Scaffold this active site. Structure first.
Site, PDB file in Angstrom:
ATOM      1  N   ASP A 138       1.183  -1.564   0.042  1.00  0.00           N
ATOM      2  CA  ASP A 138      -0.222   0.030  -0.189  1.00  0.00           C
ATOM      3  C   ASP A 138       0.714   1.004   0.003  1.00  0.00           C
ATOM      4  OD1 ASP A 138      -2.345   1.616   0.162  1.00  0.00           O
ATOM      5  OD2 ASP A 138      -2.885   0.966   2.488  1.00  0.00           O
ATOM      6  N   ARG A 142      -0.421   9.237   0.907  1.00  0.00           N
ATOM      7  CA  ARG A 142      -0.883   9.354   1.245  1.00  0.00           C
ATOM      8  C   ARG A 142      -0.578   8.499   2.681  1.00  0.00           C
ATOM      9  NH1 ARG A 142      -3.994   5.973  -2.109  1.00  0.00           N
ATOM     10  NH2 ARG A 142      -3.831   3.371  -1.175  1.00  0.00           N
ATOM     11  N   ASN A 143       0.219   7.830   2.355  1.00  0.00           N
ATOM     12  CA  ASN A 143       1.178   6.266   3.517  1.00  0.00           C
ATOM     13  C   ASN A 143       2.748   7.127   3.208  1.00  0.00           C
ATOM     14  OD1 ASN A 143      -0.823   5.676   4.000  1.00  0.00           O
ATOM     15  ND2 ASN A 143      -0.657   4.070   2.468  1.00  0.00           N
ATOM     16  N   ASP A 156       1.922   2.711   7.104  1.00  0.00           N
ATOM     17  CA  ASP A 156       0.397   2.502   7.006  1.00  0.00           C
ATOM     18  C   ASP A 156       1.209   0.934   6.500  1.00  0.00           C
ATOM     19  OD1 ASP A 156      -1.748   1.131   7.002  1.00  0.00           O
ATOM     20  OD2 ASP A 156      -2.293   2.996   6.200  1.00  0.00           O
TER      21      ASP A 156
END
Ligand code: N8O
Length: 301
Positions: A138, A142-143, A156
């Site tokens: 992932d 955003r992570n 994450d």
């Protein structure tokens, strides 16, 4: 077989920290005072809401497992867990938030040096995870969190697995290697694909990849040989690196160690590799804060 995982899981008392405010909704910004240490550590606290779902509790402890087992300057680790009604994950506060939100918020003040240094730092994080035979599954802007504008860390580990065949969930199609969408194959090389997309997000200042394309379309578009377009700021040198991350032959994509090398070379001469209007002008950065210590200077045997 494999080397034993001697990482320590630290159980914290709820009294050891105060929740100062809410960040997302549940993650809190807080301070942690290790029992009789006379330090204050700015922390982010991920507290399960429901707490009545045994399924949910098996998902946050998997994340705790992974974060406890990682120690690299470009990878976020777990300080400890608290076992109250609700499981709380305690981590280093990353004050400037996600790199996605940060490039969106600051597009006008971000120079070539920062963008390429971020690409290097994220490549080191991912190389370290690969050394630890760990597939993230992932990676996305955003992570990646911002400790300082000079300093990012991959976060994450919700979907992180070891060295991978999976069977369902809500998945990040637009960040996923073709072999992952079709056959649920994931490798370090599938992570390189997502690195590619992550770099594209930074170079477009946080544009949504394949914006307004339905996820069902994505698999077909990629077999048809289509890829995300060359961002404006990107010299063909930088874009060619993104495109190699999106080769159908997973072994034809670059290795994280090579991405480090290539982006470091480019970071040595940033204005030759990224063309940004006004690049040269670009500028970025409780009661007693006396005993405050960032987690990165708070080390345990
Ligand atoms: C480096 C550990 C870490 O991941 N800290 C962390 C985590 C989160 N999450 C999980 C949302 N954070 N959100 C913010 C705003 C900071 C932050 N830091």
């Amino acid at each position: 077989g494999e080397a034993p995982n001697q990482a320590l899981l630290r159980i914290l008392k709820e009294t050891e920290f105060k929740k100062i405010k809410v960040l997302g909704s549940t993650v809190y910004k807080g301070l942690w005072i290790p029992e009789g240490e006379k330090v204050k550590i700015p922390v982010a606290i991920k507290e399960l809401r429901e707490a009545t779902s045994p399924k949910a509790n098996k998902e946050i402890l998997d994340e705790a497992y992974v974060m406890a087992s990682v120690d690299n300057p470009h990878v976020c680790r777990l300080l400890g867990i608290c076992l109250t009604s609700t499981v709380q994950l305690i981590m280093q506060l990353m004050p400037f938030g996600s790199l996605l939100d940060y490039v969106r918020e600051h597009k006008d003040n971000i120079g070539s040096q920062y963008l390429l240094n971020w690409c290097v730092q994220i490549a080191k994080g991912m190389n370290y995870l690969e050394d630890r035979r760990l597939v993230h599954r992932d990676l996305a802007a955003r992570n990646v969190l911002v400790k300082t504008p000079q300093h990012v860390k991959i976060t994450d580990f919700g979907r992180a697995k070891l060295l991978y065949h999976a069977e369902g969930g809500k998945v990040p199609i637009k960040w996923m290697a073709l072999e992952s969408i079709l056959h649920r194959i994931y490798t370090h090389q599938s992570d390189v694909w997502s690195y590619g997309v992550t770099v594209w997000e930074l170079m477009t200042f946080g544009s949504k990849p394949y914006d307004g394309i339905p996820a069902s379309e994505i698999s077909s578009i990629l077999e048809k040989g289509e890829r995300l377009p060359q961002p404006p700021i990107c010299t063909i040198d930088v874009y060619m690196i993104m495109v190699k991350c999106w080769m159908i032959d997973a072994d034809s994509r670059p290795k994280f160690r090579e991405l480090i090398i290539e982006f470091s070379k480019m970071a040595r001469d940033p204005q030759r590799y990224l063309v940004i209007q006004g690049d040269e002008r670009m500028h970025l950065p409780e009661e007693d804060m006396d005993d405050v210590v960032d987690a990165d200077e708070y080390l345990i045997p």
